[PDB]
Amino acid sequence: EIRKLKNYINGEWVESKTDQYEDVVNPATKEVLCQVPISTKEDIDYAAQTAAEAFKTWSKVAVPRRARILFNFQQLLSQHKEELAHLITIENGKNTKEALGEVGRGIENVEFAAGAPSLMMGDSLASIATDVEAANYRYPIGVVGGIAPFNFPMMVPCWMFPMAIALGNTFILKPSERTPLLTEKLVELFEKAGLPKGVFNVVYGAHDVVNGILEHPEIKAISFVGSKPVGEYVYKKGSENLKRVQSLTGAKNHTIVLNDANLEDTVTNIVGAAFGSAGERCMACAVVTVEEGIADEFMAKLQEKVADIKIGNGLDDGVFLGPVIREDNKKRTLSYIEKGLEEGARLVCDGRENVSDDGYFVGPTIFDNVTTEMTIWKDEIFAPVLSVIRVKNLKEAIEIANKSEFANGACLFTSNSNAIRYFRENIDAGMLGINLGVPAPMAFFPFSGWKSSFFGTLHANGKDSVDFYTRKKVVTARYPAPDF
Amino acid sequence: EIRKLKNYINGEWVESKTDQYEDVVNPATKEVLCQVPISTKEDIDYAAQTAAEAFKTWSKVAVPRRARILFNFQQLLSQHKEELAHLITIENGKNTKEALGEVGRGIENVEFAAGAPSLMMGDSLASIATDVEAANYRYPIGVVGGIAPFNFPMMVPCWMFPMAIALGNTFILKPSERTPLLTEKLVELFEKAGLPKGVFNVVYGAHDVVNGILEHPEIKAISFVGSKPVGEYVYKKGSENLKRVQSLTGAKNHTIVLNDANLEDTVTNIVGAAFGSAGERCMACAVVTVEEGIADEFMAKLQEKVADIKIGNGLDDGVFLGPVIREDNKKRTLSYIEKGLEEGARLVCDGRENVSDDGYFVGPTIFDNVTTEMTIWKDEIFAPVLSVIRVKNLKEAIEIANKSEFANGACLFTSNSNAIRYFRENIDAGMLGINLGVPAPMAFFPFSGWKSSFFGTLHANGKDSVDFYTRKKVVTARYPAPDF
Amino acid sequence: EIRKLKNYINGEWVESKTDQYEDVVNPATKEVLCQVPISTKEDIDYAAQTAAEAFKTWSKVAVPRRARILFNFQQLLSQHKEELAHLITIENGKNTKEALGEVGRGIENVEFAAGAPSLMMGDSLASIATDVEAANYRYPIGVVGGIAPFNFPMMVPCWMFPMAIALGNTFILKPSERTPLLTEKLVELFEKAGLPKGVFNVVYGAHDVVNGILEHPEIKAISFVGSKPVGEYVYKKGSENLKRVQSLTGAKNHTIVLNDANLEDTVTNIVGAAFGSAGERCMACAVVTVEEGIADEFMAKLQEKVADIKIGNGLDDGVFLGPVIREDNKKRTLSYIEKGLEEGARLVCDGRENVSDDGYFVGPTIFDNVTTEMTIWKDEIFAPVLSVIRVKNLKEAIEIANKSEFANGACLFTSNSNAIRYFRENIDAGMLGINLGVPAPMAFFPFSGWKSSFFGTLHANGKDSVDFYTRKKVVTARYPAPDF
Amino acid sequence: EIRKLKNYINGEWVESKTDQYEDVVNPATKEVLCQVPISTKEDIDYAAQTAAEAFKTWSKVAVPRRARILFNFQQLLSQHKEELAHLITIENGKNTKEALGEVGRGIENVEFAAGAPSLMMGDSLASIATDVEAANYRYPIGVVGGIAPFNFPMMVPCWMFPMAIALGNTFILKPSERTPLLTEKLVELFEKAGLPKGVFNVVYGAHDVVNGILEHPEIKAISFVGSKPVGEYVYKKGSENLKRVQSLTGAKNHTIVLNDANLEDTVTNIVGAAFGSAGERCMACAVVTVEEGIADEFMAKLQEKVADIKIGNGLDDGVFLGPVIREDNKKRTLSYIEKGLEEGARLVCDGRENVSDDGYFVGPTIFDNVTTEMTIWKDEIFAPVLSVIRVKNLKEAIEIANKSEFANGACLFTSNSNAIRYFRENIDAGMLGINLGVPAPMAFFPFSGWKSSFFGTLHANGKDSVDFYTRKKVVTARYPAPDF
Ligand SMILES: NC(=O)c1ccc[n+]([C@@H]2O[C@H](COP(=O)([O-])OP(=O)(O)OC[C@H]3O[C@@H](n4cnc5c(N)ncnc54)[C@H](O)[C@@H]3O)[C@@H](O)[C@H]2O)c1
Ligand SMILES: NC(=O)c1ccc[n+]([C@@H]2O[C@H](COP(=O)([O-])OP(=O)(O)OC[C@H]3O[C@@H](n4cnc5c(N)ncnc54)[C@H](O)[C@@H]3O)[C@@H](O)[C@H]2O)c1
Structure with a gap:
């Protein structure tokens, strides 16, 4: 009678191989809305293998075409403001006005990421020496992992996957086991927008999933948003595994x-x-x-x-x-x-x-x-x-x-x-x-943020998010003038 | 029978005060599609007044809000690709394949322009001297005038008005007398997108209207796209009238x-x-x-x-x-x-x-x-x-x-x-x-472009269009540390 | 008895082929300091042809090497603050405190221009379409013309030639016939800094030289700093001659x-x-x-x-x-x-x-x-x-x-x-x-500045000066992935 | 008599408190050039305290002034290319031709860093909402620690302290114990350029000193250039200590x-x-x-x-x-x-x-x-x-x-x-x-770099170094138009 949420991996809603589930309730009435699976590292590995695969082709889709999809996403979100706001209230508790406010800022994130083509531009010089030119370019890094809090079931997630995906990376999101319903809608609308399979993956859960994200070698970057103790742990563990991470605590x-x-x-x-x-x-x-x-x-x-x-x-x-x-x-x-x-x-x-x-x-x-x-x-x-x-x-x-x-x-x-x-x-x-x-x-x-509020070098959003979700390559070439 | 096109001023379609109209034929069949008014200076004057007036409020609409409208505009444009392409073919003649291609690039202009918030960002320094900070900002210049050719009934207009409007200016567009229909569709779609009145104005015509745009003191900038002779003239007359101008010839x-x-x-x-x-x-x-x-x-x-x-x-x-x-x-x-x-x-x-x-x-x-x-x-x-x-x-x-x-x-x-x-x-x-x-x-x-192909400093599109349609104000401030 | 000034063309001090000269005095004692030649359009033609010739090699000296000369210049200037300030006071009038203030600002200009390498960088994208890449680059435009006022014998000129030179162009400067001594010192120091011949030319005079600068087809850009009537004049005349101009009035x-x-x-x-x-x-x-x-x-x-x-x-x-x-x-x-x-x-x-x-x-x-x-x-x-x-x-x-x-x-x-x-x-x-x-x-x-204080699109200094003194070439290429 | 090198703390050469000294020999002759101290924790603690104290005044020196010193430094370095190349050759082994090349590269770093004013510029918007403006700014982070390898006795160090110091930070450099002589000259020359005490510090040594840099709370950022194993350790320990680090391996x-x-x-x-x-x-x-x-x-x-x-x-x-x-x-x-x-x-x-x-x-x-x-x-x-x-x-x-x-x-x-x-x-x-x-x-x-060659997000040099040695503060302000 209480719907069990499924994970979204490689383009479709698949069920978790878990026996553990958690009740998600309406903070205002204690009514059980649905059941969230506490996915296993078995689910995380499948999700990672998938993202790494989809990355091979998604990263090859030119940024102008990807940006297009973000525009579709941006519009679909706007058309569903009432729904998204509804889901945030019954699941998180904040009233309609504040919820409606969250949806707006999360859309702004998509709007900002929709301008990815210009945001990715590197530097170029015609001549740094006789017959020598130089220019560097930005590239996605592969699969990116995101961990979201319950206080912003929509906005915080929108800080991460829209921009990371627009820049060419594939994504694995672990929404808050306390406010999972909103993310389910994001997936739906991002699929309607035209996002190909395996590019945006959602694995519900808790600790196992988190550690799988930290431990999996396919997930080259981690964006964590949450409490100080947990974020501090994620930063250290992630660095131990030699991967870039940013923890907004x-x-x-x-x-x-x-x-x-x-x-x-x-x-x-x-x-x-x-x-x-x-x-x-x-x-x-x-x-x-x-x-x-x-x-x-x-x-x-x-x-x-x-x-x-x-x-x-x-x-x-x-x-x-x-x-x-x-x-x-x-x-x-x-x-x-x-x-x-x-x-x-x-x-x-x-x-x-x-x-x-x-x-x-x-x-x-x-x-x-x-x-x-x-x-x-x-x-x-x-x-x-x-x-x-x-x-x-x-x-x-x-x-x-x-x-x-x-x-x-x-x-x-x-x-x-x-x-x-x-x-x-x-x-x-x-x-x-x-x-x-x-x-x-x-x-x-x-x-x-700063001090105990932020661990890392680059923050979320702004041009920071762009550089955190990409890596650069510089090409210095010598092309001697031909003789005639 | 034959529909007579109207001008668009202050959010509404209005009959030109002229008594002269021009037949618009389909190049491929010689049939008359409609008649475009050869508007008078009285018309161009009214457009300038109302555009100058609309500017007073439109420029006070924060760029994030103005940009949101461009996103709507981008979508509406996408859901009408076929109709837009059809219209381009009818008055221009290029097959629907190439027409569909032109509409796509025009949409790309809007997409680029929707990222106005970041494109407008100026420079900021916390300390250039002790107790002194400084930063510069970008502001719209006012009413921008645009004159477009027949070879690109949609694309060229889209290089101009979307960006200028997004950056906070009001616009007066004089499309080609030969391919007027496409522009009509743009006006209607931008209106549905939610653009307030007087921001996007269209005055159909020929010389009286072009010289009107070149002489009217309220029109601060001019973007001309056409033949070398006409563009050389527009640049010179515009410059003599002391306004910035760009002629892509x-x-x-x-x-x-x-x-x-x-x-x-x-x-x-x-x-x-x-x-x-x-x-x-x-x-x-x-x-x-x-x-x-x-x-x-x-x-x-x-x-x-x-x-x-x-x-x-x-x-x-x-x-x-x-x-x-x-x-x-x-x-x-x-x-x-x-x-x-x-x-x-x-x-x-x-x-x-x-x-x-x-x-x-x-x-x-x-x-x-x-x-x-x-x-x-x-x-x-x-x-x-x-x-x-x-x-x-x-x-x-x-x-x-x-x-x-x-x-x-x-x-x-x-x-x-x-x-x-x-x-x-x-x-x-x-x-x-x-x-x-x-x-x-x-x-x-x-x-x-270059040589006889371009007259001016800043080109159309890119960041060049951002600076061409905008001016800067720098602020150097001294705020001594208070006494405690 | 009263030393006659020469022009500086092609790295050499040549006497002007003029009969008309001008007394340059010390505003505070009416003491005659020297004689300034009102060079003829003959002198200017020589300068222009010379500057155009040298532009062929100077524009080919990689910017990193050009910037190095600016560093040397910056240092020479700093080592001569007392002398430079002395000249400013003697021919302009302002006290040495303010004069020293002026040299400092002029050196700032040189310091900013010494960062030309990074200022010239264009935009690059690895993929705008499958197998297609695009990037743009900046290049000097040719010979630039500078017309300076009497109120800042050192600073204003420094707003112009240092940056223009560093960006690859060659320069012809027409200082104020009322304060020409300072320029004599700037030329020396820039020569010692290592600047090659014909890159920085100085032609003293008035109207004849101005019109030569405005009329010569070889002089692709004009920077004017003076009164409104003259500036408004130079802006129109220069535009009539189809060349970019900027008038700070x-x-x-x-x-x-x-x-x-x-x-x-x-x-x-x-x-x-x-x-x-x-x-x-x-x-x-x-x-x-x-x-x-x-x-x-x-x-x-x-x-x-x-x-x-x-x-x-x-x-x-x-x-x-x-x-x-x-x-x-x-x-x-x-x-x-x-x-x-x-x-x-x-x-x-x-x-x-x-x-x-x-x-x-x-x-x-x-x-x-x-x-x-x-x-x-x-x-x-x-x-x-x-x-x-x-x-x-x-x-x-x-x-x-x-x-x-x-x-x-x-x-x-x-x-x-x-x-x-x-x-x-x-x-x-x-x-x-x-x-x-x-x-x-x-x-x-x-x-x-704005309104009757500025004529043009881009101002002096800042990134504006960078765009004004350069032009771009965008390269979109398709390099199909080879089969193996 | 073999000369014992000293540490440089608080703008002064001071003898290490250690009793452990290391022979520095010419790789080509096996001759002992001098002795470098293996400094203790007291030594790094002292440098850390000094650097942090000097940071309170150095960061308050506007970037335009700090950059002035970088121009001096740049010149001093150029007028000692010979002495510098010589030191590299006898200390590292490379011929004078390759040494002269390293000297140039290092000088370029200082040339680039001297453009700190513009590089530090943040983003500013006049209106992001009605009566609300916003802009962010870059600020130095505090004391930065640098650890260099033997292969580039001058260049690598010049990738670090010049930019760091220009951005407003204080520095503690631990050069290679095998090539300490070059660093000594950099310290001396930067002093002559006018660098104030405590801004540029050098502490010679091995592990005690390195671990001091990693463990000390006053050192907010660490720049490590060396082998993969040592670098991997520096990255992990550094991250474990919640400080940002970049390891070029x-x-x-x-x-x-x-x-x-x-x-x-x-x-x-x-x-x-x-x-x-x-x-x-x-x-x-x-x-x-x-x-x-x-x-x-x-x-x-x-x-x-x-x-x-x-x-x-x-x-x-x-x-x-x-x-x-x-x-x-x-x-x-x-x-x-x-x-x-x-x-x-x-x-x-x-x-x-x-x-x-x-x-x-x-x-x-x-x-x-x-x-x-x-x-x-x-x-x-x-x-x-x-x-x-x-x-x-x-x-x-x-x-x-x-x-x-x-x-x-x-x-x-x-x-x-x-x-x-x-x-x-x-x-x-x-x-x-x-x-x-x-x-x-x-x-x-x-x-x-990439893979096992780089650990972190931001590399050394370029605009990446500007962001790594800096942090941002954004300010969103509401200033209601007054009532008249
Ligand atoms: N470089 C570019 O960006 C670009 C892009 C599209 C077209 N073009 C050029 O446009 C030309 C083809 O377009 P066209 O035939 O419509 O050009 P055109 O110059 O005949 O007309 C273009 C605009 O100028 C106006 N116009 C024409 N003659 C005029 C006159 N005597 N006085 C005042 N206004 C006048 C028209 O009404 C029209 O809106 C070609 O030369 C082509 O190369 C350049
Ligand atoms: N906004 C700025 O950047 C800026 C900076 C410095 C000075 N100014 C202006 O400069 C003026 C003071 O300088 P000035 O007295 O030397 O100006 P000016 O216009 O008399 O002379 C400036 C330059 O113009 C040339 N010139 C003068 N009259 C000319 C004519 N009829 N034809 C051709 N060339 C002519 C001169 O030889 C001189 O090199 C003031 O109006 C001041 O506001 C503006």
Whole structure:
């Protein structure tokens, strides 16, 4: 009665040779949507052998023709916005608006990758010496592996396979065993777009699959997006196996609010960056360092706004806050709230109260008087928990943000040019936002995090993704002028 | 009965204020398809005003949004390939195979342009001095004027308006008076794609409209694609009016055939480059300099292949060669064929014979023993008339081609590395082709012509079109580190 | 007694075949320094033919070898800063501090140009179609013509010949007949740097030489930097002759001082921009639009600082304001002050009072209460005359600057990010400065002006200069995979 | 008295705290040139602390100024080519001609690095959404560690520290313990060029120092150039320590000779690429796959010139082949020759005979009838030992070359464009040479190796080095237009 998902390998949906399956539920109602197979390394090998085979011909299809397919894909995605958004909500929990928002950014990724022909151009010189010319070209590297998180069932995957495939590589994706349904739709639409068999492969699962991706010698590159501990493991293991990898990991993003900040706009951006998507965002505002002069009014206006948050099913309109992903995560959050109180942090808003039990719901929570000594500051909670800290000025704010081991993003609310430059010059984070709650850059820019937030050389998206998914060859040739 | 075409201004089809209309006939059957208005300056003035007005809002639409529309446009264009090709054949005459080929390249222009976000990116430096940062940006210039020829009813217009619009400008297109229908379809499809009013304007006509575009102060840039005389004039008048302009003009492309050439491939290619589309292409092969050693065998296969060429209505299966555009062009050609004989050229193949009269037909013709002193060599016949010349070696071939006033394209059929380099380094033409009949570079490359074939600095297409349709603003800022 | 200057053609100093000569004096003492020949179209023909000949070998010296000579040049220049600055002061007037400043900028140009190898790189693709590859390359165009002004005897020329030479072209420079000594030194040092004969030619003179440059078919490109009337003239004439040209012309740069401006820095910056180098600068501040609130305090501080300006001989340390270039410019300036008083403007500082007669000295003068209807606002005084206007806000300020036909540079003094963005998006000028008196961008950025300040497509410096001094050839080739 | 070299930390030569010193001998005379310290952890710790401290001010020095110093450095280096070449020759063994060549290459690296300003430029967009702009910037990462091999005492180091320092980083270089003298001069010359203290540091030593670079937290990036085994270890340990690393390792470059090859040019190029610098070159030709047709004639010609090779002291004129680096290398090579004969290879040229004993000399050796199953083909001998293989066609040669574990460079001697494209499209090596023995690409191109020849994503040199020694921060800002 509960549909068992199948893997997509070499052009068709095949069943896994596994006896292990996992229930994927709707975070808001605990209803079982389907069953996800915990594929075996046996499935990963077949998928790898397949991708390596399809690579031989796909890589020979000229980039202009491949780009064409990305255009088709781009259009099919747009036509299915309502469906994709629906799948993201019932599976991830975020409401329709935020879900619809994810679909849009994932499409932007396809749009950016559709311009692959120009993105692949190498350098060329007519003469570097008498009768000698030189030019280098870009080539795909073979089969690429991708590992996706549950917080973005569509967007993160779109960061990887559209661009990698457009550049000539074949792909093996391991979506999040918690949010697999969306990827199933991507496959369908990418097949409709005209993508040939074995070019885009999907193997559902967990650890076995991951290790198979790390261990298989056919998979020359790895793009991992997820938690710090797992991403750090993937980076090391992958390097041990002598293959390039990029791991976009955890975050503990800080937002700096200065005295001259426009409170109206600020409070709204912050409430959304901290509580939207149940705070399950690598770009979620985890800590706010507000300047003394505006601190009092900020907390007053922050509480007011936070009091109007409707908690419920992401499908219902009026709903702002959905549920955390799993039961396990709800407990970890309540534990963190408990930990905060124990460490001396002051509860300004308690999300442990007035929450439905229909789903894994947790109301917004905000702590006051927190320090860099506390666990709720050092750890990425990844739930509706915002910590607030009063600072003397921009300098102290940055010292606190920089003290965090994570450096994904940071925000600054102000209209002061000098404050902005200083912020950008001394802040450790790599994805900065001025007067914006979520500092996530658009697809044509690399998603540049730093420190414990990023392991590797080249980030995802932007021209970085292009170079990470290709390798270069340089040709220096001597062609002596003929005699007549 | 006969539909009268209308102008497209401010998002709507409007009757020209003119009382003069021009019949648009099918070159292959002499029948009237419709009438195009010979619009007045009053019309061009209104278009400029509304285009200048639309520019105020359209330029304020972020490039990612404008680009999304180009993706829709790209799709609509693909779902109408057949209709578009049909239309091109009807008013131009080329068979549906070549027509289908033109529409594909026009779509490629849109595809290239859809990547406007990255193409527009300027340069940014965090510190050029202590406390000082600097960066430059690209902005649209305003209203762009475009004037297109008849040999490419879709492609040429697509080199212009999609990019200029994507980059943020508003456009006024004056298509060829002889092939107006295609442009009508573009307008309609771009409207369905979602382009707001006043951004894409079309004013049909001739001189009054062209001079209107050249004189009107609101039209900042002019893209002209046509004959050398007209283009030389547009460049000069445009420049006198102090506006930037690019004139892609006439050609007399030369094809070099060396002894090691692959006869089979070479002949098929040259036959296509010289007689496809009735030789009415800026990239058409006009002169061929064959190396002495392979000349005899070359001529044998060429004439053998030319004998298989079937002439007729482009819509009919089996038809290779179609009609020339107007009755006046048929006469000009027959006159050239005469001057050839009159100058000593040996008419090896006569195209004045076995030519139906249902349309303006002219069979493929080829002259022998032609020299650089003949009008047959110095002028662009722009019809199905090929001239051949026996040369001693690559060097003499290049000297002959370089002697030509034009320098649009040139081809070399060989497998010798040294010849190829020597060729590229010494030939004057900017668009080179090795073992290909038509050296037309793809959209993402600038259409680099030279000499009397190009007047200006930046060519059409490629990144050249990005800078031509855009201007820069650089900002050097000093933001002292605040006092703490 | 008075040394006559020669021209530098084909690596040799040859005397001009002219009877007419010109006195070149020291603006500060009327002391005659030497005699400049008003060369004839005969001299230019010699230069052009010489430059075209040498272009055959120079364009064949691989760019890496050419760049090496630029490095040597860069060093020689650096070793002669004192000498070069001495010449600039002696013939132009500006003090040694500003003169030293000019040599530094001129060396930056040489440094940027020394990176020509990477700047010339074109685009390459291994496969655009099965078995087909495509790449484009840049090549010099031939002999380039440079026409420089008197306000930057060293820098402006350095915007031209260094980059043009490095890219493969040969050069014919026509420095200002008013400041020709500096060029004499640049020629020597470039010769010592290792530059071969005929690559860098210098022809002193005026109209005859200009028209020779414009009319000679051998001179394929013209870079002009001077007044608007002449530039507008050279742009048209050059275009009539069908050659690419770029004219960087006159300016009436506006500076906006908002209420949050740091007056300390603002005043000092404006004083130096308005009166430095006798206001004889294309980046000089001719108009200040001050916000009403801080207007009075600004005027008291500006008036105070300006009255302290020391006028004298540029070599003399302690001297801020030097002399105006000629005697006419002195009279014309006096005439402008007189015009201002007549038009209703109010004097705050009378430049007519207390001024030596040893040289063409004019004290700094400042008007207030001027309007967009006064000749004092419409014309480029190009002398130490500064007009200020009180405005309600940033919006009114921008409207005023935008009303000028000139749009070279514009500056804004504020710390408000919203004001800064608004300024950049709506201002017409192309060279903007935030909290800087002179918005002159560094050599690696195009020197982008707009409207009556620039004529053409590509500006001087930056990658713009690279494209302006080169042309491209795209090569699309088909090399079928052999059978074995 | 033998001179003891010191370390260079904080702009000062300071004695190592170690008591372990290593003799540096002239490979050609066995004479002890000096003693190099085997530094301790304290020493690297000290350098790391110093470098990190200097980084705080060096990174704040705008790139245009930092580049100025690179121009000085470039000049100083050029005015010491002799002294530099001499040091290379007595320290490494290569004749002064090849030494002078290395000096030039190294100087090119500095020439390329001097263009840091433009190379560092990021992307900037005026509007990505209404009232929202975005742009990213490049910043140095901190302290960079470099480890160089003995075969290029100057060039390899110049691939690293010059660019790193120009990009704003600080550097800690560990040169080869066998060729420390060259580095000493680079340090001294860079100091004279004006480099501030702590920016360029040198710590001589072996394992303690290397492991210090790997383990120290202040060293964010590591550049390793050496053998596959050591490099593989550096990559893994480095990655394990969460720092980015690039390992340029061993090679077994093949050179393909087709029937249409030019024996004269080919043979010369191959003799130089196989026996130049005693074959101790990552770009040296280790295997030649000759086409049957020309095989015999090739071998005969190769014999002639190989026999004309003069062996001796690098400083002596007429000397072509110098000594191998050390005794072990001589023994390892002799041992390889033994294994060759032992495996079935025909010793066509024995370099064990007629070899002086003044230094570690080994005459040119060439094997025949070698196979993919032989040790002499699978291992990098890194000495003057050539292996030849007769193959039927290009395809088989590529299959053999691709079978090698290495893929640094590959050469192809032909004039057939079809073979050339096939070669580039199917060969595994990343640095290809057409009609050139040493396919080493110029500094402005990334030194792109592959397979077991490179570990990481970004190679050394080119724009790859710019991205490897740098990190990005993107800034998306919302600045609402103010209200007027
Ligand atoms: N290099 C290129 O990119 C390119 C591409 C296509 C065609 N062409 C050239 O175009 C020509 C064929 O096209 P065509 O016959 O339509 O060219 P044309 O110059 O006769 O007409 C082209 C445009 O110019 C306008 N025009 C013609 N005469 C005019 C006049 N006296 N005053 C003002 N406007 C005038 C027309 O209305 C038309 O829109 C050939 O010479 C061909 O080589 C060049
Ligand atoms: N925007 C820029 O890049 C820039 C930089 C420097 C100076 N300028 C402008 O230059 C002007 C000051 O320089 P200037 O006084 O030497 O300018 P100018 O126009 O008088 O002379 C500049 C060059 O033009 C030539 N020239 C002058 N009149 C001519 C005529 N009638 N016919 C032919 N050639 C003629 C001169 O010999 C000189 O080499 C100012 O208007 C200033 O704004 C612009």
